[PDB]
């Protein structure tokens, strides 16, 4: 059974202009990440535009990633959907594709409750009991916060193998790590931060890895950062993290007075990837807004200056 620790980017989905999955570019991106030093891949996560792809498109992207990865690193599959029956359909797809782990959120659109969230995860686990199931804490998208007491209960019960926490709340992540360790659940329950700019903080508190969207652009930077942290080189880690945080400025280029943070952020990532020659274009799924030729030039300049070298 695969173990999901270390640097595990949420793989993006390159697209053609007509919105279909750009399989050739997706293969190039997978190679970019693996040869960049990542420890695993998270397919069909938020930054993979999972919420934008149809079920059929998700299946194609997942299969493309798993087949091209060819066992080099483990691949975990997102099963993001509103409620349990719909998530379990995606679990079946994931098993069919040979996924080595699952990533699920709380229910959304519907009102929910900690009791119902817990049942949700238990029933997802039961659909694929041999796969490590990670709980994806992402309040900006699902509008629930995953109760840390519930998570540790499910860890103890063997229902959850870990969590990917994208709440942006490092104090809360730290508290969860401390609670986990005090409960003696350190080895059983992996804690991955979704942070792109406070990865050194997470490792200093004893987190097990990172799922950074920006890791699509600069996988080598995050690999190098994790290595510094694991070697206890905290000052050096902080200096590298600061440079990564200046690369991160690509997500702030797009004018959010007329587009969402997804358009600006994921668009900035894809723009960088196209500039680096990894994918064919920065095409986005509907209804994402395009970046202007001026915005893309600014993104290029940032990439040129702050992409990691060593």
301 binds a second copy, rule: CB under 8 A: no
Q: Which of 88, 16, 38 is nearest to 216 (CA)?
A: 38
Determine, following the binding rule CB under 8 A, whether residue 115 of this chain makes contact with a second copy.
yes
DSSP 94-137: HHHHT-S-EEEPPP-SS---HHHHHHHHHHHHHHSTTSPEEEEE
| Cβ distance to a second copy smaller for residue 63 or 197 | 197
* Cβ neighbours of 92 (radius 10 Å): 12
Residues 251-290 that bind a second copy (CB under 8 A): 256, 258-263, 285-289
User: Edge-to-edge strands of the sheet including 209-210?
Assistant: 6-7, 209-210, 190-193, 162-165, 133-137, 102-104, 75-78, 41-43
Q: Tell me which residue of 142, 148, 76 sits closest to 118, measured CA to CA.
A: 148
Does 245 sit near a second copy (CB under 8 A)? yes
- Selecting among 136, 203, 222, 308, the annotated active-site residue is 136
Asked if 230 is part of the footprint of a second copy (rule: CB under 8 A), the reply reads: no
C-beta closer to a second copy: residue 19 or 37: 19
Is 136 annotated as catalytic? yes
Beta-carbon neighbour count of residue 71 at 10 Å? 9
Distance CA 227, CA 16 (A): 36
Distance of CA 128 to the CA centre of its chain: 21
- State yes or no: 47 annotated in a binding site: yes
Q: How many residues bind a second copy (CB under 8 A)?
A: 65
When asked if residue 168 is in the footprint of a second copy (CB under 8 A), the reply is: yes
| Range in contact with a second copy (rule: CB under 8 A) among 61-69, 77-85, 147-155, 295-303 | 77-85
Q: How far is the CB of 34 from a second copy (least distance, A)?
A: 27
Q: Which of 200, 208, 218, 295 binds a second copy (CB under 8 A)?
A: 200
CB 145 within 8 A of CB 139: yes
Q: Which of 76, 40, 79 is nearest to 58 (CA)?
A: 79
Catalytic residue list contains 28: no
Ligand-binding site membership of 46 (annotated): yes
Asked if 150 interacts with a second copy (CB under 8 A), we say no
Strand, coil or helix: 143: coil
Q: Choose the binding region for a second copy from 3-11, 34-42, 169-177, 293-301 (rule: CB under 8 A).
A: 169-177
Q: Which of 24, 157, 178, 305 binds a second copy (CB under 8 A)?
A: 178
Establish whether 211 is an annotated binding residue: yes
Decide if residue 16 touches a second copy (CB under 8 A). no
What is the DSSP pairing of strand 190-193 with strand 209-210? Answer: parallel
219-230 and 234-247 helices cross at what angle (nearest 10)?
A: 160
Interface positions with a second copy (CB under 8 A): 19, 46, 51-55, 57, 80, 82-86, 89, 107-113, 115-117, 119-120, 123, 140-143, 168-171, 174-175, 178, 195, 197-198, 200-201, 204-205, 232, 234-235, 238, 242, 245-246, 256, 258-263, 285-289
Residues noted as catalytic: 136, 164
Annotated binding site for pyruvate: 46-47, 211
């Amino acid at each position: 059974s695969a173990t999901f620790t270390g640097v595990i980017p949420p793989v993006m989905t390159p697209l053609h202009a007509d919105g279909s999955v750009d399989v050739e570019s997706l293969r190039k991106l997978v190679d970019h990440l693996i040869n960049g030093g990542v420890d695993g891949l998270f397919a069909l996560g938020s930054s993979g535009e999972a919420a934008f792809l149809t079920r059929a498109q998700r299946k194609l992207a997942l299969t493309t990633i798993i087949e091209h990865t060819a066992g080099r690193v483990p691949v975990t599959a997102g099963v993001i959907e509103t409620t349990t029956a719909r998530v379990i359909e995606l679990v079946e797809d994931a098993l069919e594709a040979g996924a080595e782990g699952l990533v699920a959120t709380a229910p959304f659109y519907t009102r929910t409750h900690d009791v119902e969230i817990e049942e949700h995860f238990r029933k997802i686990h039961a659909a694929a009991p041999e796969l490590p199931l990670f709980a994806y804490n992402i309040p900006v998208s699902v509008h629930s916060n995953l109760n840390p007491v519930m998570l540790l209960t499910l860890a103890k019960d063997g229902v959850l193998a870990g969590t990917k926490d994208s709440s942006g709340n490092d104090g809360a992540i730290r508290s969860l790590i401390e609670a986990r360790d005090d409960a003696g659940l350190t080895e059983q329950f992996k804690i991955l931060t979704g942070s792109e700019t406070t990865v050194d903080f997470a490792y200093l508190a004893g987190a097990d890895g990172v799922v950074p969207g920006l890791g699509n652009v600069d996988p080598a930077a995050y690999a190098a950062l994790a290595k510094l942290c694991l070697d206890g080189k905290w000052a050096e880690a902080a200096a590298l993290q600061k440079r990564i945080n200046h690369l991160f400025h690509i997500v702030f280029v797009g004018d959010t007075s007329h587009m969402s943070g997804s358009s600006a952020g994921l668009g900035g990532f894809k723009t960088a990837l196209a500039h680096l020659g990894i994918i064919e274009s920065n095409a986005m799924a509907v209804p994402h807004q395009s970046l202007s030729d001026e915005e893309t030039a600014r993104i290029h300049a940032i990439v040129d200056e702050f992409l990691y070298t060593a």
